[PDB]
From Swiss-Prot:
The modification Cysteine persulfide is found at C215. One of its GO terms (biological process) is response to nutrient levels. GO terms for cellular component: cytoplasm; cytoplasmic side of endoplasmic reticulum membrane; cytosol; early endosome; endoplasmic reticulum; endosome lumen; glutamatergic synapse; mitochondrial crista. Keywords: Acetylation, Endoplasmic reticulum, Hydrolase, Membrane, Oxidation, Phosphoprotein, Protein phosphatase, S-nitrosylation. It is found in: Endoplasmic reticulum membrane. It comes from Homo sapiens (Human). Expressed in keratinocytes (at protein level). This is Tyrosine-protein phosphatase non-receptor type 1. The keyword Acetylation applies. Residues 3-277 form the Tyrosine-protein phosphatase domain. Changing S50 to A/D: No phosphorylation. The keyword Transcription does not apply. The chain holds residues 1 to 281 of 435 of the full protein. The gene is PTPN1. The modification N-acetylmethionine is found at M1.
Length: 281
């Protein structure tokens, strides 16, 4: 509405880089003491990307409680997300332990396991029904039950079993497989369609634990996903939907995890997706 006006003005004046640097300058700075402990060195994919102490997810088993994951609790929008890095070869057991303990129903993945020929994420789920995965450190079993492969995303039905109790849960794995190798998508149409499939699945419902969202570092594409979803919720809720200030929403989210939205292009894309998604809804 007025957001498109703001959008057109920022585009005309060429000042995406300036707004984005404003956001980085104003962003919260909280301690990450646990993440920086020497014993957690091999639990972090990027030494530059750490969860704050106050919002980090704690693992419940009797062992190091640390995972590079953050609870983003958006109070006005009434939605929570867990943003986490792409699991490492030694943290896949921790990752699925977190899904179990936080009672998540959905996992949202926004990268390919390899992009531009570099690994962005471990192969943390089974690709073949008959070759399940067992995480012996956290005593979990993970089985591919079925998958629905579409042109721009794949949804998988995963069965997660707590081998200690033999309880099982169905986990929906929403994998956006078509984010460009460089830059952001030209159009937000398929990203938005993906978002709405996630919403339609029930995975974002408050009857479940928070959805787990990740890319490689869990702040860039992941940030775009949560930012767009939250702003669209706020535009549906508020009496004056044009009062939704994307920059303020993103600063609120950065109180919970550093670095959300890593480039001015990703900031522009977030505006574009919220503008188009609002029109849709
Ligand atoms: Cl230590
Ligand atoms: Cl992949
Ligand atoms: Cl890896
Ligand atoms: Cl399709
Ligand atoms: Cl980018
Ligand atoms: Cl929703
Ligand atoms: Cl990524
Ligand atoms: Cl706002
Ligand atoms: Cl940043």
């Amino acid at each position: 509405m007025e957001m498109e006006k703001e959008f057109e003005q920022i585009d005309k004046s060429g000042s995406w880089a300036a707004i984005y640097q404003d956001i980085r300058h104003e962003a919260s700075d909280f301690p990450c003491r646990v993440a920086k402990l020497p014993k957690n060195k091999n639990r972090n994919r990027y030494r530059d990307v750490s969860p704050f102490d106050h919002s980090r997810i704690k693992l419940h088993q009797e062992d190091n409680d640390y995972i590079n994951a953050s609870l983003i609790k958006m109070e006005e929008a009434q939605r929570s997300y867990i943003l986490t890095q792409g699991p490492l070869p030694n943290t896949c057991g921790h990752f699925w332990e977190m899904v179990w303990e936080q009672k998540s129903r959905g996992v949202v993945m926004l990268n390919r396991v390899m992009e531009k020929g570099s690994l962005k994420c471990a192969q943390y789920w089974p690709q073949k029904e008959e070759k399940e995965m067992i995480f012996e450190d956290t005593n979990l079993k993970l089985t591919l039950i079925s998958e629905d492969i579409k042109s721009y995303y794949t949804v998988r039905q995963l069965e997660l079993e707590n081998l200690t109790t033999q309880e099982t849960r169905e986990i929906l794995h929403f994998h956006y497989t078509t984010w460009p190798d460089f830059g952001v998508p030209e159009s937000p149409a398929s990203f938005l369609n993906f978002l709405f499939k996630v919403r339609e699945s029930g995975s974002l419902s408050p009857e479940h634990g928070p959805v787990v969202v990740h890319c490689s570092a869990g702040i860039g594409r992941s940030g775009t996903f949560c930012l767009a979803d939250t702003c669209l919720l706020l535009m549906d809720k508020r009496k004056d939907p044009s009062s939704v200030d994307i920059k303020k929403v993103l600063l609120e989210m950065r109180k919970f995890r550093m670095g959300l939205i890593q480039t001015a292009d990703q900031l522009r894309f977030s505006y574009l997706a919220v503008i188009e998604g609002a029109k849709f809804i």
